[PDB]
Write an enzyme that holds these catalytic residues in place. Structure first.
Site, PDB file in Angstrom:
ATOM      1  N   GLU A  61      10.601  58.837  69.509  1.00 34.00           N
ATOM      2  CA  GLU A  61      10.242  59.654  68.362  1.00 34.00           C
ATOM      3  C   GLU A  61       8.721  59.655  68.242  1.00 34.00           C
ATOM      4  O   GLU A  61       8.071  60.670  68.490  1.00 34.00           O
ATOM      5  CB  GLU A  61      10.851  59.088  67.076  1.00 34.00           C
ATOM      6  CG  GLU A  61      10.571  59.928  65.828  1.00 34.00           C
ATOM      7  CD  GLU A  61      11.611  61.011  65.594  1.00 34.00           C
ATOM      8  OE1 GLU A  61      11.226  62.185  65.408  1.00 34.00           O
ATOM      9  OE2 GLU A  61      12.817  60.685  65.586  1.00 34.00           O
ATOM     10  N   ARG A  75      32.284  42.185  66.506  1.00 36.88           N
ATOM     11  CA  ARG A  75      33.222  41.568  67.432  1.00 36.88           C
ATOM     12  C   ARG A  75      32.889  40.102  67.690  1.00 36.88           C
ATOM     13  O   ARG A  75      31.797  39.768  68.155  1.00 36.88           O
ATOM     14  CB  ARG A  75      33.259  42.355  68.748  1.00 36.88           C
ATOM     15  CG  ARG A  75      33.981  43.700  68.643  1.00 36.88           C
ATOM     16  CD  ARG A  75      35.494  43.518  68.531  1.00 36.88           C
ATOM     17  NE  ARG A  75      36.173  43.670  69.818  1.00 36.88           N
ATOM     18  CZ  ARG A  75      36.684  44.813  70.266  1.00 36.88           C
ATOM     19  NH1 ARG A  75      36.619  45.910  69.521  1.00 36.88           N
ATOM     20  NH2 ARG A  75      37.278  44.859  71.450  1.00 36.88           N
TER      21      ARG A  75
END
Ligand SMILES: [Au+]
Ligand SMILES: [Au+]
Ligand SMILES: [Au+]
Ligand SMILES: [Au+]
Ligand SMILES: [Au+]
Ligand SMILES: [Au+]
Ligand SMILES: [Au+]
Ligand SMILES: [Au+]
Ligand SMILES: [Au+]
Ligand SMILES: [Au+]
Lengths: 394, 371, 394, 371, 394
Positions: C234, C379
């Site tokens: 960006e 997870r």
């Protein structure tokens, strides 16, 4: 190509004269002997014209009398053809439509010839073109000059018409059969909805026709002992009913003290007599079969359709609010007839079809307390405006 | 390759009858459309006939024998002679109603064998997720049959009485014994209930708070479907209702060491109840029926609750209708949650519909209306 | 036409059982013996079902034992086929997907038969049609009734799950490897970004994830001696840096007096260790090769991608933010793995793809001073919300 | 008509490797796309493989051997047997990275011989102003090759230091010795500078006032391009800057008889300088490069200045990028003027960009930022 | 395929040199001997270049002198061809356009060769591709480098140009023929509209050019005895006139007391001399024939077209305000010439075509009492701005 004609149609109008002389009046209005394609036909038309011209009426013998003088009788095929020609009409009534398409065909027939004349006047006539410019221009303007349909129905007749219409407005009561709202209105103005009649109340934003239609509904249920079938495809059964109760005896977010006042209403409808149906977007077909079964078992009276548009009897292409809405319209008419009862269908606006030509009575609702019903069409009756106070629900 | 279900004996009866009476055509059109006719000619003719009527003109056999002439289908249909033949086929002309009806029956048949066999050819070739073509199949059948009595209002009043009996003075059991239970004598059996809440801070609470009552406080079962959020997200939210814990966790790091007790007690109370959840983002018509059907034949079923230009608003109706059809198909009471930004044809299929401190208002009925 | 089946897939699930018995659990969940197209196969599946039914475990001999009793062993092809069937599996793991498509094929197979039955029930069964109406209607509703996939994972398990999740939240520190922001957050909650992990911070309007991501970036550059490669597609290299300096030690349109305070910041990064890259809309491929080369030369640590969307690894049709963004997502995962380092990818919203199923940890940022990071997926770890004061840039 | 640059040895290495490991496909897709593959089958296969992965499912040879089955391309690709053949083609499966890379190299080739030869057939037939097809040609080549290391931040700090060295305590020479010169050590060499001015009464003045300084006061050259106005229009405007004449002519009929002196002195000062103008309404990417290139090989070059739904905003970027590419291609410092009604991807290619009595602010850098 | 060339065009420029030596100046500017397709031609061009190089002028003998030294004279076809080559020019004037298309053809000719070279460099040169990447990239950038058209017309000449333009502004009166508005303006600045000239006054919202154009109109009607034909296709004849009366002597919704003041105006135009035509959207063709007939009968002077756009001489596709408006523009020019009178056409704005390149004088109107006319183009005259008070209608 085979030049534009319909010998069958010609035979129709032609033979329709034999069946009735009134025919020759309408036929000659639009057509002119030679305006027939089949030569024979133009003679048989000219001949009946010259023979109806002398004064003597037109019969199968009269027309073959004049026809004999020139001895074209052998040419046209004899009186055998004349008679056959009288069989070849499916219904001397609506002779105009038969003549119409003969006027049309052979009209259009000249269109072809006149243009083809311009085409030839093109290949050979090169000498001066500014002349053809305006020339072929007026020849086509001339082909649009021979269509005989059109008559300003003066201004005198519509004056005497507006008079005997007020003289028709100047009469006494005697509601024949129907017995509706505040007498002055529908009841008096048109003996309270006749049988076989198709009625149309035209609404607008905030359909008051719903309330008005169901008021007429209960009034014809409470007062007379007639069975009014009402198809409310917009709102639910139970909804309609309670709306009708607060209608006949005085809320929404409430806890009532005068439950009785609601019982008075509840009791009021004890006579009942209204069979209400609400299943949405109902096929007009089922409107007929269901409505009719009721008649054969218990007996009808009148039917009310809450929203004429929502019906949408299905089929082919929609074609911008007209085609299907019209076949549904004349389906209601053919129904009100084959049901022998009046049928109030409700409409509104934002030429909504052909309903006007099908309606026996078309009425509009106007205002802004007081509201007035202004009836426009009323086949066999007067014209009219009549007002009834309205308040909230009555 | 055998012979289609052909109507012509009954067809000719209709095309003939029309030529005999104008009202005949109106009643033919009353149920069938040219496309319906089988014979190539019979279609063109019945269509021409219809365009004449549509034209505004009268129809008996010249107008149509000349319309048929235009756009030249005349010599094609069989000539005037055939047309005449039509007229003579039938003497009287009022039994078209039943005679034409036969033309429609046989049309539906070829209409069905066509749509059914369409499903066959669809199977053998397109593997585009069986979830869809197996589902699309059920819809094409619904599309063919339903669309090609009156009411007792002294009776409807009965409903208005039983209704008022409630308004002043249980069958599925809802929340506490407040206005909601009497408002619907429970809030039960094989019907659809839509509870509508605008972006009111996600009024999902009302939905599961009840679902909870049904399971924990009632002793019945409930199938809840959260398509937006996750399962744990809500069960933690359920506890916010049980231990009235000024809601969140993190309050002291892991949780509040003193109020740790309410957690074990709220979780203990909730554990003994039977609630069955399932979060499968976007899924609700087909599998919901299949999962509830499986659950019912197992333990028995619950009161179920769901959470949340021309190819959009129509799709919502099809599921709205399906949620209602699911209710009676499984004698279950399914309450769905909708938004207010109406939003389709919900008020049509829906049974008691309700819109949403503050209060709630009840909408159209099976029971006492608004309060 | 050749009826819808996949004998190869069948062989896959079928033989996958031999490879492992766990297979027969998942297989039987969805499938039922006769639900196999090849006759032999249905027997070999039924046989292993009845033999695993009696209690005795399933081995290549066990299944041929039950299979022998009925003496279909010669029919199915012998133990020769049984063994071959065990070779015909590419990986007994993900047997579900093999069973799935067998469940699918033969499911769809009945669809065909049931409809063709309706077709025949059409030509001959003309007697009564309203019956077929609802009849063929339910037969298809019945074919959608036999797809065995779907189980309400109760409400009990998710209760005990939310419990041991809080009990998992009740533990001590010990950041394994990563060492991020204010301990309480990422560091404590999940031992500070594990290796091979794909991390996803979800932003919104006015992406604070940029500042947050680079803070984690320098903190893992200043504190530990790890090399953090950061792809900022960006903003420009120099821009990022200065933004990071005023971030670590306090402006835009200014003439500074405390240049030193800027030197303290300037010096702070002397340890460095961050290799910043800004070339815009970089192909994910180059993200991998460049990122990896650094590892093999100097050694990595973790990679930060400033804006997950701007990557747009190219190729085929876009297909509304999902297809290509997902193949890029699992490309980052396969990368973080084959790079053995964590990778924080930044996203935001206005199902932004399949990133969730690829992410090992997904975290969102919420607020309106103070702002809180709420991690959703993690997870192998707890759930969580943790707040860190934010002010202007820190 | 000879043999295309065919990959299959390396292709089969990729299609095979995929069947051996899931990660294999991820790395294949990492650089190439089915369309890339040469063999008819190899494409269909690699595509099918991708749709399975895309599907969310796992890929090794059954899912794909059955996907390939759907939309029946199986018997077409070569049967399962061939697929098997793929798997055996390669033992281990990690060197797909380089093996697949080969598949791409050869694809670019056929991709190039196709686009190049496309230019040939274009020439022989379409005479649609050579200005365009000669230009369109250069673009189709740029389109094929670029699109099918890290940074030193201790170093980037270096840039931040040199930067601050300027902020407190010449290489191309700009206006007077004000904040502008130190702001960019000149305002020089082969880079692009965009000066942006909203409808601020046409802030073109700032642009040429500098261009003037460069030529008249500096002794260097400058190429100015006015695509809106005419040449005389601006040189008369230049004089308004020199003799600070309350601007216009007509002031006394022809001019002011007393101030006639400043005209000869302002025109005399300006004459000795070297400014090269050109007004050719709408023209700026191609000929500007060609004209500046010609001017450079002649006298030497100057600091140049330019004045001013889906088929518009993209076209502006292509020229913005070209103006930058022109700078390095000609070691010239080109400053362009933009408007503010952003307006595209200028801040991306642009080097020091500046937005515009009043003051001016400097934007992103090569030197000290905003002041 | 037959390589892109035009031997005829080559012959044109080539032979155009014989006709005039000025030709060889313009030709060599763009072209270079070998830049000719036909071999002979390149020699005959090189030969005339080397012979015009030595100093000695170029004649049919000179060019065959140098050409003889190398003895290519037999090769090029002899002096027979040289002479023929001088006949093959349709007009040595506009040699540039002939050279142009030769520069173009053979330019484009290399495009083909260079690309086909890349194609071959593709099939065989597989060794290293990153090299070809930038290689074939610059070869095409090189083909766009050899188009010799383009020269910065310095800044020195435009300085001395702006000077003698003010020195051209420093002169005395002497209106040659036209005699317009307040002298200082059009009259003085450009001797009052010369003959054959196409004038263009550019308006804007609220077209004052209408009033201004008709003021010039009457002034050239009242003052001189010239006949000014004015096509006002916007407004009606009578409307224009009265607007012109209140213009010359002072309302709309009124009952006047000074009818006389209107008579003074009414009389003023008694001299008349203006033939006004208003028939809307008139074909430019009729603008010419009508306008010309007047000249041959009574005699013209100047023509004014009220709104240049409304003309729309018809034909082929519109093509966004440019194509048809330009063929109409040069139609007015070819007209003003073949009519030997000035023609003021009025325009306005919201490159409105090619009118500029056709106009001999283009003038704009600016302000917000006082308004100023600023003339931009004025072939053979100065530049300029001049103001005239305007008030309401004068
Ligand atoms: Au009512
Ligand atoms: Au009510
Ligand atoms: Au809750
Ligand atoms: Au909670
Ligand atoms: Au930061
Ligand atoms: Au900063
Ligand atoms: Au200036
Ligand atoms: Au000036
Ligand atoms: Au005027
Ligand atoms: Au006037």
């Amino acid at each position: 190509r085979i030049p534009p004609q319909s010998i069958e149609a010609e035979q129709a109008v032609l033979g329709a004269v034999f069946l009735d002389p009134t025919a020759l009046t309408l036929a000659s209005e639009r057509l002119i002997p030679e305006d027939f394609y089949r030569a024979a036909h133009q003679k048989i038309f000219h001949a009946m014209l010259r023979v109806a011209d002398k004064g003597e009426p037109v019969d199968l013998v009269t027309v073959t009398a004049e026809l004999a003088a020139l001895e074209q009788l052998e040419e046209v095929g004899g009186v055998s053809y004349l008679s056959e020609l009288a069989d070849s009409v499916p219904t001397a009534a609506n002779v105009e439509y038969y003549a119409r398409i003969v006027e049309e065909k052979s009209l259009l027939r000249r269109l072809i010839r006149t243009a083809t004349s311009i085409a030839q006047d093109g290949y050979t006539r090169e000498d001066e073109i500014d002349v053809l410019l305006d020339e072929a221009e007026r020849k086509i303007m001339e082909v649009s000059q021979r269509k005989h349909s059109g008559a300003f129905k003066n201004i005198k007749d519509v004056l005497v018409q507006t008079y005997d219409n007020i003289e028709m407005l100047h009469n006494r009561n005697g509601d024949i059969t129907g017995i509706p709202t505040g007498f002055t209105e529908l009841d008096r103005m048109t003996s309270g909805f006749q049988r076989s009649d198709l009625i149309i109340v035209a609404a607008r934003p905030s359909v008051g026709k719903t309330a008005f239609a169901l008021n007429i509904a209960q009034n014809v249920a409470t007062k007379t002992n007639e069975n009014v079938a009402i198809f409310s495809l917009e709102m639910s059964a139970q909804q309609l009913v309670m709306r009708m109760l607060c209608a006949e005896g005085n809320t929404g977010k409430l806890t009532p003290e005068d439950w009785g006042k609601l019982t008075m209403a509840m009791g009021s409808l004890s006579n009942a007599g209204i069979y209400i149906d609400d299943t949405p977007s109902i096929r007009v077909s089922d409107i007929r079969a269901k409505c009719r079964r009721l008649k054969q078992e218990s007996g009808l009276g009148m039917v009310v359709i809450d929203y004429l548009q929502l019906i949408q009897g299905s089929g082919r292409n929609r074609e911008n609010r007209q085609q299907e809405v019209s076949e549904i319209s004349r389906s209601l008419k053919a129904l009100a007839r084959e049901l022998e009862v009046p049928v109030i269908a409700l409409s509104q606006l934002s030429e909504s079809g052909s309903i006007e030509q099908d309606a026996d009575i078309v009425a509009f609702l106007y205002r802004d307390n007081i509201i007035e019903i202004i009836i426009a069409k009323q086949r066999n009756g007067p014209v009219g405006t009549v007002q009834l106070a309205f308040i909230k629900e009555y």
